[PDB]
Each structure stands twice: as structure tokens, then as C-alpha cells.
Amino acid sequence: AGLLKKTTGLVGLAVCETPHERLKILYTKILDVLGQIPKNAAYRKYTEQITNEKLGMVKAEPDVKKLEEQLQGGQIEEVILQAENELSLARKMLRWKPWEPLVEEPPANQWKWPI
Amino acid sequence: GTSVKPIFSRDMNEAKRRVRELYRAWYREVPNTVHLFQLDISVKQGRDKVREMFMKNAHVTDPRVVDLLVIKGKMELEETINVWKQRTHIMRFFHETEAPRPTDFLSKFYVGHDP
């Protein structure tokens, strides 16, 4: 990383001097949480796809500056912030269980909007 | 159709309970709002206004409606307690400037066209 960047530019979060292992551990944790999620759910498929892709690129390229470039998520700090948010989302809707069919249909004409 | 979602109360008994300590708070409030707001209202004629307003919505029987009146009275209680309300709004319940309105059909006929 050479000279560690002083500030990411956003005052809501600081610099992670060792970002690669953070990406690794958070990605592995969320992959575990998706392993919890049943196979048939489309959420597990999509999120496992994007996360295993992200883990592949982060473990492939070890330069942080190129890591942001091919990660298209700005500075690595907001990337691990978004990874924490994704972990949180998967955990929170583990028991929300949205993979089930719709709870019930809307009542009669509840969406037509010429009145 | 008949099945519906509650707000807080399950049955008439528990909403009947909520209006109970709402009247509790109004009772314990009236004297020191008379004192604090420099009301021209008297203590007894303060309490009976609360009683008459509580009796005004005597016809209500749907539970959810009762939760709605109780939470609106709760907002009224907060507005009064921490002096967000003003003396004029407190008087607003007492109809001073409002002239007495006749009730009999004969007076209605004498005044003007109105049912």
C-alpha cells in the first residue's frame, strides 16, 4: 500500500490499514450465512454469486488501488462498510424468510390509477 | 372482512383499561394546568369538561377506533403537559365566544333555513 492514505475523503469512516483480510473474513462470514439460507431461495444464488466473485477478485489482486478499480466501489473503506451491511441484511432477513410465496393478493383494484 | 388488525388493544376490556388511566392522567393534570396556564377555568368545571368529552364518544364500539381515540388523547396529554399547547388552545374546548345555538324546531324555523 506504500504510504497509507490519510483520509478516505468521507468523514463518516476511517482508513483500514489491512483491508484485504477484512474483505476475506467478512466475505467468508456472509458466505456462511448464505450457506444457512436454503438452496431454492434466489437471494442465496444471487448473493453467493456476487460475493464469491468479489472474494475471487480480492484474493487475486493484492494491490489496494487496483482493488478499488476492479471493485467499482470507491475507497476500500466504504467497500468493507457495504460488506458489513450485506452481512447484516442477510442475517436480518434469515428469519424474515421472504422466499415464501406472496402473503396475499391486493384487494380487488388497488393499483389501477385512472380513477 | 370481519377479521382485522389491532393497534394495541385486543378486546373492549383492554381498551376500556387504556381510557381508564387516560382519565387518570387528565384528572391529575387539570388542577396544575389550571395553576400553570393561569386558566380562568375552575377545578371542578375543568374536570367535568374532561368527563363530557370522554362521554362525547360514547357510541364507539370498534376496538381499533378506541385505540385511535386513546392515542389521540395521549398526544393531547403530551401537548398540554410540557406547555407546548397555549392557553387559547386550552380554552378552545370551552365555547365562550360561540353564541348559544337553539335546539327546538321552532327556533330553527325562526332563525333561517337549516335542518
Binding site: 424468510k97 421472504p98 406472496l102 396475499e104 | 393497534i7
Partner: protein, 209 residues
């Protein structure tokens, strides 16, 4: 060009938004009811009320969704539909800059769960709806009246509520204070009869029955 007055049509954004609409419909089939993208490239998601917290969180948190900005929160009262009130959440993305809209329905009494946690900006917006449409929000941190005057009544934006309200206020020397009086206009609002009896847009014609 040939169409200098007609607005430009951007079909690429339309197809891409439709793809994301199918995405979000597949991800949360529990609450989503009907997703569609308008002609002017604005997507709307019609969800069941119980999905106010989940769907928003999925839109606030998911890596491939990435929406953290509550542009506004609004209710649109329409007395015709069985649940008259409909609540619109407007979200804007930063990493994937775009505007998404999720719409739910509720009647006067059936409460709709308060977002607040998903978007802490909703709070004041939330209060407005309760103070302006009667839509109570479950476990909202402080659902006190926000906009209207003190000790008010009703919810003015309800289409049944009259334009002029019910009661004005003015000085009274007999009681030496501002007092509230039943409405008595000095000149009544003339309600003009616009909307000519000839059909405007054949495309949006209501089917017969």
C-alpha cells in the same frame, strides 16, 4: 430532429430498470405484489404493507441494490379504493445512481409499520403522514402532530376534508384572547367545472364492463 418537441426516449435505462425490477421481484416474493416501470424511465414497486421494513432494508443494504437516501415519503389519499391511503417511499441510489419507488396501501385504521430504523430521515416525514392523513404508524418513536396547529382535528389532506377547513381563529375582546370559531367565509370558493367532456388520451382508456 423529426421530433423536436417530444421528449427524448431512453430505452436503455428502461430495459436495465426492468431487469432490476425482475431482480427485486424474484428476491422478495413474500411482500412484492406488482412491479412496473413507467414510460419516462421511473420504476415503481407495489408491495404488501408487511414488507415496509424488510423490502426497504433489502433496498438499503443489499450490495447489488445500494439505496441509502430517503428522497421523500408521502401518502396519496384516494377514497375510491378499499384501503384509501397509499404510501410512497422514494429511494435514490449513490453507487448505482437511480430513483426507485415502493408503494404500499392501508386504510384509516390498519396500521402500517414505521420504517424509521431503515431510514432515520423517515421520522419527520412519518409524522407528517400521521398528522396529515390519519395513517398511524406502528411503534414510531414519537408520532406527535408535526405540521398543523395545536389541538387540531382531522387530517387535512384527506380528500373529504373541505378546502377551507372547519374553524378559523381571531381576536375576541370579550375574553381577551384569540378564539376559534366555526367557518363563515366572506366569499365562497367558486368551484370551476373544468375537465371537458371529451376524451383526451385514447391510450389510457378504462376498459368497459
Amino acid at each position: 430532429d423529426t421530433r423536436p418537441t417530444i421528449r427524448p426516449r431512453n430505452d436503455v435505462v428502461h430495459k436495465q430498470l426492468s431487469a432490476f425490477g425482475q431482480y427485486v421481484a424474484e428476491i422478495l416474493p413474500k411482500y412484492v405484489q406488482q412491479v412496473q416501470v413507467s414510460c419516462f424511465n421511473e420504476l415503481e414497486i407495489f408491495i404488501h404493507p408487511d414488507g415496509v421494513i424488510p423490502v426497504l432494508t433489502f433496498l438499503r443494504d443489499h450490495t447489488n441494490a445500494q439505496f441509502k437516501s430517503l428522497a421523500d415519503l408521502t401518502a396519496v389519499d384516494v377514497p375510491t379504493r378499499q384501503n384509501r391511503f397509499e404510501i410512497v417511499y422514494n429511494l435514490l441510489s449513490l453507487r448505482f445512481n437511480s430513483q426507485i419507488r415502493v408503494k404500499t396501501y392501508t386504510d384509516e385504521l390498519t396500521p402500517i409499520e414505521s420504517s424509521v430504523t431503515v431510514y432515520k430521515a423517515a421520522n419527520w416525514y412519518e409524522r407528517e403522514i400521521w398528522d396529515m392523513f390519519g395513517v398511524f404508524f406502528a411503534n414510531h418513536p414519537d408520532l406527535r402532530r408535526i405540521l398543523t396547529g395545536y389541538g387540531f382535528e382531522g387530517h387535512p389532506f384527506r380528500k373529504d376534508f373541505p378546502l377551507s377547513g372547519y374553524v378559523e381563529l381571531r381576536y375576541d375582546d370579550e375574553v381577551k384572547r384569540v378564539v376559534a370559531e366555526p367557518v363563515e367565509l366572506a366569499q365562497e370558493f367558486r368551484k370551476f367545472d373544468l375537465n371537458s367532456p371529451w376524451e383526451a388520451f385514447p391510450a389510457y382508456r378504462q376498459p368497459p364492463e
